[PDB]
Swiss-Prot record, chain A:
Homology family: Belongs to the ATPase h subunit family.
Keyword terms of this UniProt record: ATP synthesis, CF(0), Hydrogen ion transport, Ion transport, Membrane, Mitochondrion, Mitochondrion inner membrane, Transit peptide, Transport
Organism this protein belongs to: Saccharomyces cerevisiae (strain ATCC 204508 / S288c)
Quaternary structure note: F-type ATPases have 2 components, CF(1) - the catalytic core - and CF(0) - the membrane proton channel. In yeast, the dimeric form of ATP synthase consists of 17 polypeptides: alpha, beta, gamma, delta, epsilon, 4 (B), 5 (OSCP), 6 (A), 8, 9 (C), d, E (Tim11), f, g, h, i/j and k.
Name of this protein: ATP synthase subunit H, mitochondrial
Domain of life: Eukaryota
Subcellular location: Mitochondrion; Mitochondrion inner membrane
Gene: ATP14
Entry function: Mitochondrial membrane ATP synthase (F(1)F(0) ATP synthase or Complex V) produces ATP from ADP in the presence of a proton gradient across the membrane which is generated by electron transport complexes of the respiratory chain. F-type ATPases consist of two structural domains, F(1) - containing the extramembraneous catalytic core and F(0) - containing the membrane proton channel, linked together by a central stalk and a peripheral stalk. During catalysis, ATP synthesis in the catalytic domain of F(1) is coupled via a rotary mechanism of the central stalk subunits to proton translocation.
GO biological process: one example: proton transmembrane transport
Keyword Transit peptide: yes
Organism classification: Eukaryota, Fungi, Dikarya, Ascomycota, Saccharomycotina
Swiss-Prot record, chain B:
SUPFAM superfamilies in the cross-refs: N-terminal domain of the delta subunit of the F1F0-ATP synthase (SSF47928)
Subunit details: F-type ATPases have 2 components, CF(1) - the catalytic core - and CF(0) - the membrane proton channel. CF(1) has five subunits: alpha(3), beta(3), gamma(1), delta(1), epsilon(1). CF(0) has three main subunits: a, b and c.
Upper classification of the organism: Eukaryota, Fungi, Dikarya, Ascomycota, Saccharomycotina
Family to which the UniProt record says this protein belongs: Belongs to the ATPase delta chain family.
Protein name, UniProt field: ATP synthase subunit 5, mitochondrial
GO cellular component terms listed in the entry, alphabetical order: mitochondrial inner membrane; mitochondrion; proton-transporting ATP synthase complex
GO biological process, one term: proton motive force-driven ATP synthesis
Annotated compartments: Mitochondrion; Mitochondrion inner membrane
Cited PANTHER family: ATP SYNTHASE DELTA CHAIN
Length: 62, 187
């Protein structure tokens, strides 16, 4: 009765208002890239280090 | 115990009055006399309804009773003792309260039930009659009892009707339905 009236009115006479996906973007965190592979670069290459180390600390094992 | 109880002071007076006249088996007599003394009190508005103000003496109260039983000599006699009691307890001021209360009790004994069809505005006489018929027909009115159905105007109830009687109601109204409807679409 009143149920029917409400049902009728609600469904028919107004529905969803406008709302854009674009506007949504502002309110969410957007995807961004995982920049950089982050290559490590070789350290201590060559016997330059070795000659340095042999000479530098001469402290013997006790 | 007399059918229909009346809670509280002033209606303990009514309860007593009824059961007292019930054992005399002269309840109709009581009722008639009570209507009559109430009426001639009511129809003497200044001086004797507006001189039921609580300030009169014991002796002056007794003399108010004497004037009351002077006003007509037709009184049940149980209700002549009742006049004395209310004076003696000096609660005479509430006079009509006991009268109304005896009435409620009495017409329950008579069988009459009262209902109400509150609506936004007064409804059709055709509606009154159709509802009265239905309500009397229904098991709710046990029969061997009558229904004085009263439409009352209550703007607060928006449209519909609400049937009330026997402290049992069916409320199909637009205001009440709107309340529930609104609520359900706020979830």
């Amino acid at each position: 009765n009143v149920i029917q009236d409400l049902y009728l009115r609600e469904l028919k006479d107004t529905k969803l208002a406008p709302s854009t996906l674009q506007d949504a973007e502002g309110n969410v965190k957007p995807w961004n890239p995982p920049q950089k592979p982050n290559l490590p670069e070789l350290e201590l290459q060559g016997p330059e280090a070795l000659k340095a180390y042999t000479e530098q600390n001469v402290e013997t094992a006790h | 115990p007399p059918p229909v109880r009346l809670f509280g002071v002033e209606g303990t007076y009514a309860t007593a009055l009824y059961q007292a006249a019930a054992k005399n088996s002269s309840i109709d007599a009581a009722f008639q006399s009570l209507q009559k003394v109430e009426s001639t009190v009511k129809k003497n508005p200044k001086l004797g309804h507006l001189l039921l103000n609580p300030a009169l003496s014991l002796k002056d109260r007794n003399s108010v009773i004497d004037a009351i039983v002077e006003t007509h000599k037709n009184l049940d006699g149980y209700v002549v003792n009742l006049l004395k009691v209310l004076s003696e307890n000096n609660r005479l001021g509430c006079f009509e309260k006991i009268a109304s209360d005896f009435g409620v009790l009495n017409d329950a004994h008579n069988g009459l039930l009262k209902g109400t069809v509150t609506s936004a505005e007064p409804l059709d006489p055709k509606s009154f009659k159709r509802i009265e018929k239905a309500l009397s027909a229904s098991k709710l009115v046990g029969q061997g009892k009558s229904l004085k159905l009263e439409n009352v105007v209550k703007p607060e109830i928006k449209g519909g009707l609400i049937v009330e009687l026997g402290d049992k109601t069916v409320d199909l109204s637009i205001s009440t339905k709107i309340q529930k409807l609104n609520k359900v679409l706020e979830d």
